[PDB]
Design a protein around this ligand. Structure first.
Ligand SMILES: O=C(C1CCN(c2ccncc2)CC1)N1CCN(S(=O)(=O)c2ccc3cc(Cl)ccc3c2)CC1
Ligand SMILES: [Ca+2]
Length: 223
């Protein structure tokens, strides 16, 4: 997260770290045994880490669980990042508590102008790379699809939504991928892509979660 702030310890209880020897992506706990992330964060073996604040220091609230089933959206296109959503079934259910809690699926698509919360342990620099130890937070609004499409001519699909600032300075970045953008207690987006980090007129684009509520529920039920 570029231009964000350090989240209060365990204030984003649904945030998880996808670890494969190191943190490489984020995700959201949607129920005691399922995590939603980005298809582009796929790996054959993943250890999901919950109750994290400092990813490099044991603080006493962590629960490390291995992924049992990693299911990318069937129509994920690695070239356009369309349908960039993935579901992970944990090998065993986690203990839900204050620092480890679930986030709700969207009941409807949030209107542009809605203020949302983005979080992650991704790169904090607009140029270069700096991986933070502590979970970062960013308060950003959903942008009008018109401004989104205008920023990325021909690249924005109906399954994508821009969140951020047209002036730059604040944005998601590498390592935040798969992470959540929660608006009013509901998961409205998933960190997906951008051509840089925190650049003017180049807001980050996220997977529009409201378009997959059905697929999510179905896949969960059938697995
Ligand atoms: O420009 C790119 C790719 C991004 C993926 N890509 C397309 C091209 C067309 N349509 C969809 C995706 C081709 C160019 N990258 C540079 C930035 N990196 S990144 O710094 O690791 C990154 C990763 C995720 C991000 C997510 C957000 Cl929401 C904002 C910036 C982000 C930046 C990703 C690859
Ligand atoms: Ca820790």
């Amino acid at each position: 997260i570029v231009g964000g702030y350090t989240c209060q310890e365990n204030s984003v209880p649904y945030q998880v770290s996808l670890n494969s020897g190191y943190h490489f992506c984020g995700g959201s706990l949607i129920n005691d045994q399922w995590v939603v992330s980005a298809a582009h964060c796929y790996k054959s073996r993943i250890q999901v880490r919950l109750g994290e604040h400092n990813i490099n220091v044991l603080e006493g609230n962590e629960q490390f669980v291995n992924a049992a089933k990693i299911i990318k959206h069937p129509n994920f296109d690695r070239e356009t990042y369309n349908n960039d959503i993935m579901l992970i079934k944990l090998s065993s259910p986690v203990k839900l508590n204050a620092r480890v809690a679930t986030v709700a699926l969207p009941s409807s698509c949030a209107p542009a102008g809605t203020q949302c919360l983005i979080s992650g342990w991704g790169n904090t620099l607009s140029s270069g790379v700096n991986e933070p130890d502590l979970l970062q937070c960013l308060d950003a609004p959903l942008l009008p699809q018109a401004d989104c499409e205008a920023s990325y001519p021909g690249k924005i699909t109906d399954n994508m939504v821009c969140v951020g600032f047209l002036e730059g300075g604040k944005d998601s970045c590498q390592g935040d991928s798969g992470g959540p953008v929660v608006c009013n207690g509901e998961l409205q987006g998933i960190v997906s892509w951008g051509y840089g980090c925190a650049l003017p007129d180049n807001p980050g684009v996220y997977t529009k979660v409201c378009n997959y509520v059905d697929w999510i529920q179905d896949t969960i039920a059938a697995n």
